[PDB]
Amino acid sequence: GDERAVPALIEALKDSDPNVRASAADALGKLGDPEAVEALIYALRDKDGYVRFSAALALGKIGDAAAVYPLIQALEDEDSRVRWSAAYALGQIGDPRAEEALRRAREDSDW
Template sequence: KVGAGHGDIVVPALINALKDSDSWVRSKAAKALYSIGLGHQDIVIPALINALKDSDSWVRRGAVKVLGKVGAGHGDIVVPVLINA
């Protein structure tokens, strides 16, 4: 798994990559958060919610998928956002 055991370092870097000028980088960052976002929901969820506004549909799709996983247990925050996405 990408970044296994190094989430405290990798997660912030991936969140930063969600702001990259290249949509491919943003999309891959969202997908990578799927693997290591658990345990870091406090910073991952807000970043993914912001990624739902991305101009690229692949980035938005990746953000939805990851929110479905890392947002488990945080339905009060995630569900309304996904309904309105």
């Protein structure tokens, strides 16, 4: 499609304003562009939970399997909202490895 906007949106993920970073993540999500998977995977480790949530949702809409292990790791995030946005993303991607991870993450919490 229109790749022209993608580089500035990836740069907007590095902005000092977390609202700008979450906005950029939402925009890249609507595009569903695989050109932003790496940048959004990095955005999953952002200091702000509202950005991590937005990056997780955007990764789900892109549907690229490169996000599978980082999203699996985001199931053990301190912020409970990030946890179900990561789980929603994994569900959308539809990779079998997520199933085992969800049942395993249940075992680690139960102990």
